[PDB]
Amino acid sequence: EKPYMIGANSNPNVINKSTTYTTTTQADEQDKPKYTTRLEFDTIDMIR
């Protein structure tokens, strides 16, 4: 009903942000994938 307006910003200020270090752990994980094109040799043509 009411018009949709941007309004004001909400992000607060942050100071002295420290880096993230990957934590060592013996526990298992799952490796986040990327699905995309694969490159391969033309082994048949290599035989030729």
Binding site for another protein (CB under 8 A): 1-9, 11, 33-42
Q: Which residue, 27 or 46, is less far from another protein as judged by CB?
A: 46
For another protein, the closer of residues 29 and 42 by Cβ is 42
The pair of three-digit structure tokens given for residue 33, joined into one six-digit string = 């994938």
d(C-alpha 38, C-alpha 26), whole Å: 31
* Residue closer to another protein, measured from CB, 28 or 45: 45
Find the shortest distance in angstroms from Cβ 28 to another protein.
19
